[PDB]
Amino acid sequence: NANPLVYLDVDANGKPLGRVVLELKADVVPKTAENFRALCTGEKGFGYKGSTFHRVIPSFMCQAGDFTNHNGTGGKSIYGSRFPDENFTLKHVGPGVLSMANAGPNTNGSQFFICTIKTDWLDGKHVVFGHVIEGMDVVKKIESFGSKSGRTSKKIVITDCGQLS
Ligand SMILES: Cc1cccc(C[C@@H]2NC(=O)[C@]3(Cc4ccccc4)CCCN(C3)C(=O)/C=C/C(=O)NCC[C@@H](C(=O)NCCOCCN)NC(=O)Cc3ccccc3CNC2=O)c1
Numbered sequence: 001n002a003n004p005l006v007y008l009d010v011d012a013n014g015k016p017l018g019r020v021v022l023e024l025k026a027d028v029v030p031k032t033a034e035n036f037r038a039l040c041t042g043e044k045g046f047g048y049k050g051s052t053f054h055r056v057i058p059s060f061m062c063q064a065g066d067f068t069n070h071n072g073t074g075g076k077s078i079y080g081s082r083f084p085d086e087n088f089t090l091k092h093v094g095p096g097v098l099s100m101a102n103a104g105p106n107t108n109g110s111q112f113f114i115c116t117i118k119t120d121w122l123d124g125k126h127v128v129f130g131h132v133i134e135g136m137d138v139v140k141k142i143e144s145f146g147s148k149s150g151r152t153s154k155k156i157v158i159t160d161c162g163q164l165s
Pocket of ligand 1: 071077110
């Protein structure tokens with residue numbers, strides 16, 4: 001079975017930035033990939049639609065997915081509030097890596113990040129589970145509205161998301 005492709009359509013201050021297309025590596029991390037896929041489609045009754053990129057740091061990563069507290073302290077997975085680190089097989093190889101945000105070991109929920117640089121120091125600490133395959137330019141636009149603290153200069157909103165099937 002082919003790896004799922006999913007999308008995020010992103011606004012800045014109500015103005016469309018475009019579409020990010022992500023391949024989820026369900027072959028290597030099936031459980032982590034399925035959580036993200038299901039949060040994109042909303043099929044458990046909750047997910048990413050309408051939530052924000054709440055922490056964006058230039059030359060590091062763009063972080064999103066806290067649809068419960070919208071500030072980096074929340075989120076939940078389709079398995080429960082948190083689920084374990086599935087494996088650390090895939091590595092933070094460069095820009096475009098899609099990886100799980102966490103608050104330490106075995107705290108995956110819904111928050112995720114897209115790298116804008118090789119973040120190798122996160123290897124073995126954050127579960128990588130996909131990669132940008134179209135729309136890296138959009139990711140760079142998101143990055144342009146970040147700051148050193150991560151606070152965004154514009155409201156960055158995932159206005160739609162889903163699975164490309
Ligand atoms: C409950 C839950 C479940 C799943 C995910 C999450 C998100 C998770 N919430 C948090 O921890 C906190 C703490 C808290 C409070 C209440 C409940 C739970 C936790 C709240 C949000 C703000 N909060 C801390 C940070 O912001 C932390 C930054 C950090 O960990 N600082 C170290 C160096 C940096 C790097 O390497 N910086 C390089 C800078 O180079 C700039 C170049 N120009 N590492 C990082 O950011 C590591 C990293 C990596 C990817 C994604 C996220 C994160 C951080 N995890 C968070 O945000 C929370």
